[PDB]
Every structure is written in structure tokens, then in C-alpha cells.
Amino acid sequence: SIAQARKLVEQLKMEANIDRIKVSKAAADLMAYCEAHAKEDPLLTPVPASENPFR
Amino acid sequence: GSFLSPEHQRVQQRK
Amino acid sequence: ELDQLRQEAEQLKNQIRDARKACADATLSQITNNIDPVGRIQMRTRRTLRGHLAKIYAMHWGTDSRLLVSASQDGKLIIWDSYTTNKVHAIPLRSSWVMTCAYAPSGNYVACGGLDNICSIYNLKTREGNVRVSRELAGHTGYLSCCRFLDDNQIVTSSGDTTCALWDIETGQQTTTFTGHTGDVMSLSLAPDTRLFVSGACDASAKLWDVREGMCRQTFTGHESDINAICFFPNGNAFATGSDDATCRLFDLRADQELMTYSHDNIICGITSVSFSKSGRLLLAGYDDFNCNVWDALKADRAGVLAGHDNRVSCLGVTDDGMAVATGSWDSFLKIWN
Amino acid sequence: VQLVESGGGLVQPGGSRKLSCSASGFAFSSFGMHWVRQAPEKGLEWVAYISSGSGTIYYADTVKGRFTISRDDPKNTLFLQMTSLRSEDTAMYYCVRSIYYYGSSPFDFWGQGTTLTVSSSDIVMTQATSSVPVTPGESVSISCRSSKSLLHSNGNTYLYWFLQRPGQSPQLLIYRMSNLASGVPDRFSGSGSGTAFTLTISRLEAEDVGVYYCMQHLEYPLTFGAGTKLEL
Amino acid sequence: TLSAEERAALERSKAIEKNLKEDGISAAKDVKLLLLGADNSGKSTIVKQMKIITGIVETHFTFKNLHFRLFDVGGQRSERKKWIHCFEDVTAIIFCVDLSNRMHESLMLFDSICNNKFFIDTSIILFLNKKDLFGEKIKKSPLTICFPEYTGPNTYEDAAAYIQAQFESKNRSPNKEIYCHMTCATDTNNAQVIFDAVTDIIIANNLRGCGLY
Amino acid sequence: LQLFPAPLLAGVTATCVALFVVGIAGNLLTMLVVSRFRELRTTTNLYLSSMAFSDLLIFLCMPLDLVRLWQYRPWNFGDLLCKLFQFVSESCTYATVLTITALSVERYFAICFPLRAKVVVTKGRVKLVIFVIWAVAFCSAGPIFVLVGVEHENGTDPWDTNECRPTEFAVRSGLLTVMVWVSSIFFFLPVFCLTVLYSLIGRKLWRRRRGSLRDQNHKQTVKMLAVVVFAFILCWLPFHVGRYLFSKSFEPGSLEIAQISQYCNLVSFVLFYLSAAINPILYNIMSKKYRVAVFRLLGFE
Ligand SMILES: CC(C)CCC[C@@H](C)[C@H]1CC[C@H]2[C@@H]3CC=C4C[C@@H](O)CC[C@]4(C)[C@H]3CC[C@]12C
Ligand SMILES: CC(C)CCC[C@@H](C)[C@H]1CC[C@H]2[C@@H]3CC=C4C[C@@H](O)CC[C@]4(C)[C@H]3CC[C@]12C
Known about the structure:
InterPro entries (chain C): G-protein_beta_WD-40_rep (IPR020472), Gprotein_B (IPR001632), Guanine_nucleotide-bd_bsu (IPR016346), WD40/YVTN_repeat-like_dom_sf (IPR015943), WD40_repeat_CS (IPR019775), WD40_repeat_dom_sf (IPR036322), WD40_rpt (IPR001680)
Strand content of chain B: under 5%
Radius of gyration of chain B: 9 Å
Keywords (chain C): Acetylation, Disease variant, Host-virus interaction, Intellectual disability, Phosphoprotein, Repeat, Transducer, WD repeat
Family (chain C): Belongs to the WD repeat G protein beta family.
Helix content of chain B: 25-40%
Strand content of chain A: under 5%
Largest sheet of chain B: none
Pfam families (chain C): WD40_Gbeta
Number of helices of chain A: 2
Number of strands of chain A: 0
Oligomer: heterohexamer
Protein name (chain C): Guanine nucleotide-binding protein G(I)/G(S)/G(T) subunit beta-1
Largest sheet of chain A: none
Bound molecules: cholesterol
Order of helices and strands of chain B: H
Number of domains of chain A: 1
Structural class of chain A: mainly alpha
Largest interface: A-C, 40 and 59 residues
Number of helices of chain B: 1
Distance between the termini of chain A: 61 Å
Structural class of chain B: mainly alpha
């Protein structure tokens, strides 16, 4: 309890020196991923029954 | 289920 | 001295809270306010996999998207053929108190573990014809809560002694120990490139780790109760987290905060399982109200229910090609949805 | 893993003889077993089959009625009771194991042989070539042809390749028309069309000289091809 | 199942389902009992017959053609809430209390176990061990040391009967019974006391299964 | 309306509608619940679902009984129809009575020998027990076809004079009074098991706290053991003394026993359709599993 409490500030200083992008950009990137991979999602838009392996 | 006829006894005296 | 340094830790936490405050330009809800909804997702049960006697605690798909392992507390580990409902193998376990199971991405190995504090590795391609134990990894002090293969020689295990561990299956010893959670680690999820992994614990905390380094890179704190379920987004830049306060949340690793919150006022019971569809547009979540809900992952609408189970939905999974969803449950049946 | 057979010798025609096959080193109760015989200069010829638990038995139509297959799971042995021995039953009998689930490798271990010497709707597999003069380092292509399409509606093409070296039992190379077996090198390769199949060896070595067979496993009885011999 | 290999694969699947049922029949004729004592009480010592199988420890014995399985989880020092649903389907809970510092800890444990949301309908066998050591230290150390609201004459006949009331006042559910038995810890009688109490659970389980109360 | 006075037929048709929409409610509900929830498919619910079939078929034959009760005259509906309604109802009472004897044997072994291995009738052979019960139900009600049938008055025009009665060959031969003596062992033989086995079950359960709230739970148990014994006596003693006075009414020169058969077989009418309604209640009202299954089925709790 004498040094692990001082090792706590070392990890807390190491995760403060990171580069955060803006939250508008990361919301726009997850939006851009789902639009590009939309047509190959068999649960979002289902396949016909000829290509469905479970029917 | 569980009756006699409405005209029961008069025909039995005739039989 | 110990009071003064944690006094400095109290302001050092204030810096990272302000950096999260500074990066908050606009909500994900108002960015995705104009895109079209997914509609209404109706899925039907294709298969029902019968043959477990006790209740089912874990299932994992194979990477070939056809075989799947399920674990149960009758003491058997069963590999299924999902197309034909055939039982390929049935592995009798030593300890029947099993809480997790994994498939190797090669397909040659299957792991399992639970209340015996041991991750046992089973060899499936034996040359003697029977499935046998190749190694049982014994170094954890609490129950095994999750295990995931990196390849056929490395496995990451979560445990209830507040510690995740990286093993070497050839030599049977820990390679890297991941400490820092204060509560029991209840789940973990690997990144698609398998260089990072997230782990959620009972102290309502999620932690982003580094596999070859061994350090904690980020800590995400939004939940109010115990985290039971975690899953990475398909591109590896976000993850979803389900907890006992009946809430899912989407965090992202680059902006270092939460993005959206998936909750309903009719929903009062905790999430047991989460997974993502192949594009990451749907988020399937298993609940204690005996059914699964499909969430629009980008707009937080609830689009669809998977209600077919007589008991609590304990496990859940989506194939790699994205065709089927398998949900196991405490009523001892797995189903497959499409 | 080994299979050893015993009980072969000079027999008068019309009599009887029992063949035993004792297994060692594998879980014998979960494998189905076959008998396959080889005439003194001809090719391979399937005889009988018993499944795991003896719940399914098939025979060749040549021997149907007069041969009986049986297995002893407590003692780990296999039996072929042979009655009414004709002079066409002089052969060398092989004990073959095979296990069936999704993705398995049937016909993958063969016994050593017993020399039985008797005194004096099917699918036809065609290897029209029978001899090729071969030099090491070169590229070989062995072609087999079937009278029925071996491709099934599930997606599998049940065609297997075996190699018999001079003085040894056969050995599985390719299973289900493309899958390289465990223990064989990567220079073997298999391609198919449903009716015509090819086995390509990339560079020859000295450990590849022998007789190559194609088998079908689409329906019973299982019919081998004639032998395609490779020589120096 | 049309192919020759799809037929033999389905024959293997049916052989697995038969062996799965033959195991479910052999295991359903078993009584599973969860040992939940506090710290070191008497839990690891009440197991008269030792046939074992740090994790979870299972000891088993047979008594009058009935096969008992006892699951100690004392070595599981984790959060109890997470693995407690694994034992939702046990017949009874066997709770051991040492009557000789750990008293109010054992009560607060018993309050958590008896009022658990998985352990409604699950009855409890409450053993109270070491009454041969409780009998003389009550002459030196009265029950007002730990239970200050005790208003009795400090007699072993009713100090032991007052402590038993403190445990049974935590029940707060009519669907479960608390059986109770003061073990002397030198007794070859705990196999029968469990056996008599498990029979009363099975009868009352059968009255519930036959729609008859 | 020569049979009973004019308002008295109206009061039975009112109270049999109320036994109709309640009798088919609790009987449909037992077959729906055991079918959907696989956890409720015990052995006891498999006996109760086939007993819910008999109390469903008995209530389907109840429209025909009221048109016979309000009009015993003419009966021009079907010369072969009234053989069937009398066959289907009377075969169903055999099954109902013998199911109540089947539940009394199985809840004897569940309680009086609770650790028993059950070697004779396993759960797999319970399904075969239900087929033996419906075999004896259909063969012992078999002689209804020889016995009863539409009958017209000798020498009259039968367009307004037929009667679905036991025909003259059956009252002449004595084949009817044989039938009552064979229908009576469906009352005497279950009451020699219901009153013997349930008085032995209460001998064990009252031995409990001799051997507070544990007393209260075995006091509501024998309260339910006394209801299902007395409700078998209440419904089936007007029945079998009802059809005994029917058979003796054709004995020569008897009128004092004839009119008693008019009224004993009317108070046997309502109690027979009351017992078909309350048999879903008495076996499924103290079960905790069944009540949460109905609310999970209905969607409202
Ligand atoms: C001609 C008659 C007298 C013989 C056959 C009818 C009676 C006596 C027989 C036929 C079928 C038998 C039943 C078959 C099924 C069961 C359920 C079992 O758990 C207890 C015994 C019990 C309840 C039997 C009781 C007696 C029984 C009802
Ligand atoms: C022919 C008409 C008049 C009556 C015949 C209906 C009877 C014989 C049929 C109809 C529905 C059937 C029941 C429905 C299904 C089951 C579940 C099975 O696990 C046990 C038998 C049991 C309970 C059947 C017993 C026989 C049964 C009751």
C-alpha cells in the first residue's frame, strides 16, 4: 500500500499522454464502415433462399 | 350420459 | 506521502476527464439523425439443437461457420454440425462446473474452463480417433470466466481473481500477466488483428490491453453495475459492453469515451451476451427476460426480438460469414436464426 | 496405430477359413472397418464392411451369402468367415479402418495382408492409362474417369487416391477429390470435374514410385480403378 | 443423409445421443448438496466418508442405496454472486456453524444465502457443530459478549436454543424449511440426519410436482 | 314439455351453458400449456391432458343432450347419430374415471414410497398406460351400439314418434340390466382405490410433525385429499343409482320406482357436467409451476 498507490499514478500518467481524435470523426468513421459493408450482411438484408445454407 | 319416455307408463300397461 | 500523490492522482483524473470533455463536438445520435433506419428485423428459428441435459453456459462458432461447440453443466462438451444438426463429438469433462468454451481458429483444438480454475485444451485431430486432453493450464486463483485462442499455441484467459493471463500451450506456463482490475473479470474480446483485447469486469470498468507489451492502454468507465458481456466492432475501433443495469454502451478507442447508449424503460434485467453483425449495423444482446433484442447500432432503435427460449439466454454468437445467429440458454437448447 | 492380420494359407476349394484382424493403438470401437482384397497380379477389390456397433453390414455381390464379417469390441478384433471357397478367392486380404463424421478422413490406415491361396448398377472407374515412363523432378498427371458423376448435391465429390509402393500396403493420398491427407507431402494435388479427375505430382522423387488407384465412395459397393504404375 | 458418408455420419450421431441419455439416467438418481459453512466451522469435517472427486471440492458417499454428492466452495474467494447460480438445482444447502468471533459473520452470510433469488424453494439443513466445546466455555464466557440482547440465565440448554432462533429468524419464506441438528463433532450420525432430512425434501418436492399443495 | 315442468328445463339449460364456457376454458388451457412448455410435460400432466380430452369431448356431446332433454319425442336427427353421441360420452366417462384412478396410484408412489425406483410403469411406459385406458374405455362402452337406438311405435307413422331409447330387444333379453352391473364397476373399483390410497397417504402426512407452518401445509393437503374424494362421491353416486332405477323401471308393474328415475336422472345430469368442468380446477390449482405457465402463455400477470 506504499508503492502500488504510487504505481497507480504512473499508469494514470501513461494513459493521459495519448492523442484523442474528435468524437465527430470517430462517429463518422463507424457510419462510413457500415455503409460500405452493408450489402454483404445476410442479417441486415437477407439472402434469397437459394443461397441460405439453413433453409 | 344419464331418461324415460314422456308417454312411458301408458304403453307399458298396453304391451 | 501516499495522501499527497493520490491527491495528484485526483487532478490527473481531472485532466483526462477534461480531454474527454474537449473532444465532445457532437453526439453520435445527432450525426446519424438523417440516415435511414434498418426497418424491422424478423428472424426465424432454422435449427434447434437438442441433446444437452443440464443448462448451457457457453457456445462458440468455428471459423468455417458450420461447426460449433457448446458447454453445459451435465459435464459434456458437444461439437455440432449446424447444417444437419449432427453431433460430431461429445467430450466428457472432468469437472462439470464449466463456464466458458472456445474453438481454435484452425479447428484442431477446443478449450474450456470454469470453477476448477483450469483451462483444459482438447485435441480434436488425434490419429487415435478419440478426443483427448492435450494440456490443462493451471495458474489462476479464481474461476475461469472466458478464454480465447490467438493461434494454436497462445490462449488468453480471463479469471475471477481480477486477472487476465496470456498462456503458451506448448510449455504450459503464463507468458504475460494483465493486472489492474479491482473486481472479477467477467468477459474478454479479441481485436480482429489480435494485437489488442478489451476486458470488462465487476468494478463496472472496461480496459484495453496490449498483447505483446502487457500494459493497460485505456480505461472506460460508464456503467453503474457489473459488466458481463463485451464484443469488438468489426473494424477494431469500437466495442460494445453489456451490464447488469440493463444497458449496452458503445465506446470507441480513438475518441476515448462512449458514443451511444442502448437502453429501454421496459428493460429491467441485465445483459448476459452481446455480439455484432458482420457490418456492425446490428447489435444482438441476450437478456434475462428470456429473449434477445436486436439494436440498430448506429441510431439506438430496437429493431427486432428473438423470443424462443423458456429460460435465460446465456450465450450468443454470429458466424464469420454472417449468415446465422446461435443463441444458447438455460433451458438446455441452442437455436439458430436467420 | 497398427493392424495385423493372421489366418491365411493353402486351402482346398469348397472348404472354409477364418480371417482375424487384431487392432492396437487406436479406439477400435468407433471406427468402421472394411476388407479389401488383391488378386496375385490384379488390382484392388472391396469385399465387406461393418460399421461402429455392427449396425450396418455390406458385402460385395461376388461374396454375398458366403462371407460373413463380424467384430469383437471387447477383444479389439475383426473377423471374416469365408465359406464355399472358389479359386477366384486367391488374394491378399487387407484390413482397412475408416471413421465417418464431418471433415474426417476415411480409409486412412491399411493392414499388412494375409495370403489366402485356394487351390485349383455399379459405378465403373476407368484409368485408361496403365504405364507412364517417368523421370525424377518432372511433372506427372494421373487421370481417372467415372461412369457416373461423383459430385453430390451437398458439394462433395467422393473420389479418393491411394498409392501402393512395391511390396507394401496402399496408403491414402487425397480424400474427397482435393484434400491432402495427413503425412503426405504438399507436392501431391487433386482436381476434378465431377466425371474426370486428375492427380498432379509437382516434382517426382524416389519415394513416389508405385501403383496409383482411384476409388469412389459415393455409393456402395466401392469400386477401385485399375492400377496406373509409375516406373523409372 | 443421402450420401454413403452422410449415412454413416448420421449413424454416429445417433450413437452419441444414446450414450448421452444413458449418462443422464445415471446422474439423475443423485442427491447434490451444497456445503456453505463460514470460514473454518465444521464443513470440511462433517464429511464422514471421504471420497474426494484450488477450485471446487466434491466429496461423495452412498447411504441406503442413495448416492450423495457434496460440493464445498470455500476455496472460491471471488464475488459469490457470480457463481452462485451454478448451484440453483441442488436438493438442499448444508450450513455449518461453529458454536465455540465468526458468529455475526455467519449470520450475515446466512441472511445472504437464505434470501437469495436463486435459493427460494431450496431448503437448508443447519448443523451447529462443536457443542462439546460450547458447553464449558459458556460457563466462562457468557452469551452477552457476542449477543448483548440475550436475557436468559446463561444455560447451555437455552443459550444453544436461542442461537438457533437467531438463524431461523432469517428465513422469511414459507416455501423452504430449515432443518436443524446440533452435532457433537464426535458423532457417526450425520449420514442419517442428512438422510432423514433429504427424504422430507423429496416428499415435499413430490407434493409440489403432483399438484397437491 | 311432458318430461319436466316448463321453467325447470330452462334452469338446467342456463346452468349448463355456464358449465360449458367454463368447462371448455379450463380444458383447452390444460392442453395448450402442456403442449407449449416442455418443462410442464411431467407424468402427472400427461394424465391430466388426456383427462382434459375426455372433459372436452363430453362437453361436445352436451348440445345433443339438451335437445333430447327438452324433446324426448320425435328425435328425427339421426337414426345412427344417437348411437354415436351415447357412445362417445359414455366411453369418455370410462376414461375419465380410470384416469382419476391412474392419478391416485401414481401420487401414492410419489408420496408413500418417495425413493422408489419405479420398475413397472416408467415414464416411457406412461404413454402406453393412456392407450390401455382408452382401449377399455372404448370396448366397455362398445355394447352401447347393440343396446340403444332409435325406435318407433309399433304400427304408427314414425315421422313424429321415434325415440332414441334402449330398444325393445334390449329390455326383453335383460341385456340392459347386465350393462348397469358392468357400468357399476367403474364406480366401485375407483372408490376402492380413491378412498383406500388417499386414506393411506393422509396416514403418512399426518404422521409428520408428530414424527407450526409444516402442520399448516399438511392440513391444506388433506383438505385437498378430502375434496377430490368427496367430489367423486357427489357426482357419481347420483349417476349409478340414477341408471339403476332406469333399468328397474321396466320391471313389470312398477310405477313407484319409475318417477324416482325421472328426478334422480335429472340431478345426475347437472352433477355429471359439473364434474367435467371442475376436474381442470382440482388438479391444477395448487401447482405453482402451472400458474406461472398460464400467465406466460396469456401474456398478462
Ligand atoms: C377390467 C378392469 C377391471 C381391469 C383394467 C382396469 C383397471 C383395473 C386397470 C387398467 C389400467 C390400470 C392403470 C394403468 C395405469 C396406472 C398408472 C400407474 O401410475 C398406477 C396404476 C394405474 C392407475 C393402473 C390402475 C389399474 C388400471 C386402471
Ligand atoms: C377417438 C377419440 C374419441 C378419443 C381418442 C383420443 C385419444 C386416444 C388421444 C387423443 C390425444 C392423445 C394424447 C395426446 C398426446 C399424448 C402425449 C404422449 O406423450 C402421451 C399420450 C398422450 C396423452 C395422448 C394419449 C391418447 C390421446 C388422448
